[PDB]
Amino acid sequence: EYMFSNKFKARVMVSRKAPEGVTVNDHKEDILKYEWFEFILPEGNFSATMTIDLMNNAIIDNYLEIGRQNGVLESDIGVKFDTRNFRLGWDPETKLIMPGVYTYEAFHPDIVLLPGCGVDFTESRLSNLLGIRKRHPEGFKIMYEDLEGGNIPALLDVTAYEESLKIQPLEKDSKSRSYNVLEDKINTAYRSWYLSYNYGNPEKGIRSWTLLTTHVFNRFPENQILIRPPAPT
Amino acid sequence: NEYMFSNKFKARVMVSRKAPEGVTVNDTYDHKEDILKYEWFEFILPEGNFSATMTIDLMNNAIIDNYLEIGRQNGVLESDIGVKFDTRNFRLGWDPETKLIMPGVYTYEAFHPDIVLLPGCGVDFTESRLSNLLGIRKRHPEGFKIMYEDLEGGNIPALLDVTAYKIQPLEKDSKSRSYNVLEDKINTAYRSWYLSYNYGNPEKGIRSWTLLTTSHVFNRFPENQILIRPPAP
Amino acid sequence: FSNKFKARVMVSRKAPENDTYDHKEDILKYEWFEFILPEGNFSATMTIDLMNNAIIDNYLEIGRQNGVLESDIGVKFDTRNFRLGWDPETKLIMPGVYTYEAFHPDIVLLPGCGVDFTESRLSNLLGIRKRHPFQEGFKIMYEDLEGGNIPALLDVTAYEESKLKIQPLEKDSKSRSYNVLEDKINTAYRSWYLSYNYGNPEKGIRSWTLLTTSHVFNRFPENQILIRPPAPT
Amino acid sequence: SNKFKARVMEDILKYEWFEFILPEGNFSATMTIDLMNNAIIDNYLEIGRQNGVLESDIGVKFDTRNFRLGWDPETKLIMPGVYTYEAFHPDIVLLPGCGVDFTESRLSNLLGIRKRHEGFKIMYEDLEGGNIPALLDVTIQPLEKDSKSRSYNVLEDKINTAYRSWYLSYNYGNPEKGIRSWTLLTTSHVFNRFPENQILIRPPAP
Amino acid sequence: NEYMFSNKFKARVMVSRKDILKYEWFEFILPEGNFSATMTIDLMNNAIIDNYLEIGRQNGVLESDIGVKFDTRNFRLGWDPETKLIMPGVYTYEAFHPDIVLLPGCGVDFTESRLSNLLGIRKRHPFQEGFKIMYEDLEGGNIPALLDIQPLEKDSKSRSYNVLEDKINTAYRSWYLSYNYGNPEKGIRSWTLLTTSHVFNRFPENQILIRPPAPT
Ligand SMILES: [Zn+2]
């Protein structure tokens, strides 16, 4: 009867420590622990942008009670709801985002994930408001492993290319938050459902079983991944 | 009657605030011993078809006009008004460790019309249709009075003293108006219907018998974060 | 001609028939005219600008050349709720200016003036109607708006430097008389909206009228009564 | 096809009729008015300007203002010195010898100007009583020229202007002898080449 | 069919520049979604440029020789019948109707595409089973050159505007100009119909390649 309506579940990072014996040296922390939680939003009829802001606020509210106090970093959040088309300013030769910033235009609500994380909309109605549905329907869980081909490309170090030409990716933000650039030095550890749906394998990736359909809310103004998503105009 | 005035509501507010009829009041007399007297009134708004924001403005202006007539001349402070209609989701920027609103100000975004109350106060919508315009209805319908004791778990958290960030709450606004911080110095005496509905006990709080649905003279306290003019949707 | 209204306005201000003469004995004459607006399908707020322009066009044609002042216009259509900002103890508009928010189209009148909507459809567009079809004809005169006197504004420059000199403002910036009366709280201006809402509910203008839903246009930007009415939204 | 026909042009004055063509599309009233003025000016820049006609004798303009708004009954002029820049209804402004013809056009029905009936031709002689009052030189005499020395076409008596407008003759002309007897008012920078001329300024948008 | 990309089109652009120039057809695919005409035009231009950044650019083709641009402006608005140039010096920045701008050797094909309906460009006759719009079909739709009495031959960043002989018109042709100003019974108007409908601004100084204006 009188239960909660705007709700979803997700798997986030809870702990980030060293091996049981290791002690801080002169990395950061190697052992990572993840756990499922149920996130509850305040009731009401919200738009997609307002729902996305509240969903991100629930993820960060979890990070502030169990995690920040257990060693996890802001660069390890691992679940974010966005609206951008990453890799928009992508260059085929340098394989980096040349403008140095992801295009700040709203295209379609999105799910950005880090390794070991995911979301589950089996008992939720927010997937429909976000226009992300199951193509053929029991169970709706989108994990990091299901988003093959949807890796977010790394941004160019524009401060560096303008020191001469040195093309290199940007490894940290203004406040020294890791952008999670990988060994290939072209891609980022973040994966997004929108990139895997449009740029992944059309008959084997996330598109084969999903369907695209029709300030406290900006705690990381410097981080290009955690920035507040743009609103549709 | 065709002259019923239509836009009206009843509420209980503070009338007096007089130190006990006694002997002395040194510079070390606890003003928690101040005797507080309350009374019921019927408030009438001008006739017209107003939006929810304009209705909230006129409902708040009716509360203040009563304070200017009776309470102001009987020792009641502007920090003891006791009935305010808002649209914000207080405790948005709340931190589970410090237990304070870290931005120092409540998030100035409109979510849903809200009723904020101080101890001894309340509103009554038994003979009024303004609650339907405010999207606050009875779940199981004879009588609709929402009092301070009915908003358990909806206490508004205290704001962080950002000019001194130490980790203490702000206890006065810029014009030296008491924010009504309590013992433990994390929460405030103000309770809100929206908080008790969403963050209170689901089966014992205000949510069990009220329902959330869809529906400068107006800024006399620009300095005070509690009595500030509500944001517009 | 579709849009047209009738109104009684002042036509002459002259002595009965030395700087010792008191101009409270000036002979004042009023006359009925029919004011016609350009044709079209206008909004209420655009209609109000045209109806006031018709009043001024008559003042420039006869009244101005016959000794009447801009303080004696006597018919103005507004949208404000005057006496918002009224204080129950000082009985003045403490902000020193009337609230510039549109509430409902209003009729403001001076002694001896009035408006007649017997052969006019503008009263329906302005949301002002007769409550019963007992007698044909629709005329609202200054004598019917008892209890709808517009309170006077506070002399803020005297109240602010006193620190208390709580006295009404008796003239505007360009030295236009606000027509303040004895007791120095109220004004000779009356409004239908104030008498409708704040007058006697069973004997005032409410008993036979009904409220329903709805720079040449700013020739007196300094005068708080003749200022261009605010637009909705 | 969105088209219409109109008549357009130191001492002698020539006049000639033409057919003006608009680019195809479904446009609003403001964009339609801008295209029709550009079609008039485009005709002046080819046949006319090179033949001794001045920018003070264009003769056809589509506006939205209510000229004579700031009119004073004593001076018989527009005291603000500028016409009120508010949109009231799309209008047709004409000079002597000019006119517009909507006999094959559907653009008048979009501008809310229809015949109560045929054929629909509106000439300067049909707008009797719709003369635009002259502005006031603010320094009691009418302003005779614009900032760039463009004649406002002031007439004798120094109160009225040679420009006539359909809206003024419809609302302030004779109700049973003017343009109102057979027309009806209904509901609906390349486009600003004369910023100084109060008559030729880009019409305001609703 | 179910997983087929919906927002796609085919076009012929420049691939090699070494002068003899070579062109080839490609199929451009847009991200899925229901986008407006304004937002779709930005994605179609990004697909053309993304192809230039891959095939081309490495082979000597210039940003002057891009050759497929989707616009919304009415070029030749500020055109003068005597000087035959755009006297304001810039094309009018008002949105009229989505448009196709082409250079010699280029073209677009909407035979297997639903984007022509969203761009308000339809076939006037179901007689035709294909819908290809080439540079040779836009006769009379040359975009006039800008003034400064001489035409502007390069952009602000030294990009050739591709001004031609006679120094009045440009090598760029547009469907909207050929539709409204070309031969009514011989140009593109005879078999097409006009109907109702930063990474997106990589050439801010180029008047031809500037981001198209948005309606209203
Ligand atoms: Zn009755």
Numbering used by the authors:
A (entry chain B): 13 to 38, 42 to 152, 155 to 181, 195 to 244, 283 to 301
B (entry chain E): 12 to 152, 155 to 178, 196 to 245, 283 to 300
C (entry chain A): 16 to 32, 37 to 182, 195 to 245, 283 to 301
D (entry chain D): 17 to 25, 44 to 151, 155 to 176, 197 to 245, 283 to 300
E (entry chain C): 12 to 29, 45 to 174, 197 to 245, 283 to 301
Authors' description from the paper:
Adenovirus-derived nanoparticles (ADDomer) comprise 60 copies of adenovirus penton base protein (PBP). In the ADDomer, the PBP monomers spontaneously assembles to form a pentamer, and twelve pentamers organize into a dodecamer characterized by high stability and thermotolerance exceeding 50°C.16–18 The PBP monomer folds into two distinctive domains; the jelly-roll fold domain which is located in the core of the dodecamer and assumed to be responsible for multimerization, and a solvent-facing exterior domain, called the crown domain. The crown domain comprises two highly flexible regions, called variable loop (VL) and arginine-glycine-aspartic acid (RGD) motif-containing loop. To expand the scope of ADDomers for new applications, we engineered ADDobodies, representing PBP crown domain, genetically separated from PBP multimerization domain.
To validate our design by high-resolution structural analysis using X-ray crystallography, we created an ADDobody prototype with minimized loops, called ADDobody-Xtal, based on the assumption that long flexible loops could be detrimental to crystal lattice formation. ADDobody with minimized VL and RGD loop sizes (ADDobodyXtal) was crystallized. Crystals grew under two different conditions, one containing 0.1 M zinc acetate and the other devoid of zinc. ADDobody crystals grown in the presence of zinc adopted space group P212121, and diffracted to a resolution of 2.90 Å. The crystallization of ADDobody proteins in the presence of zinc resulted in crystals with a characteristic needle-like shape. In this zinc-containing crystal form, ADDobodies also adopted a pentamer; however, the pentameric rings are not stacked on top of each other. Rather, a zinc ion mediates the interaction between pentamer rings participating in crystal packing. The zinc ion is coordinated by four residues from four different ADDobody chains: H151 donated from one chain, E13 from an adjacent ADDobody chain of the same pentamer, and H151 and E13 from the juxtaposed pentameric ring. Moreover, the structures imply that multimerization on the level of the pentamer in the ADDomer nanoparticle may not be mediated by the jelly-roll fold domains alone, but that the crown domains also contribute, given that the ADDobodies were found to form pentameric rings in both crystal forms, in spite of being monomeric in solution.
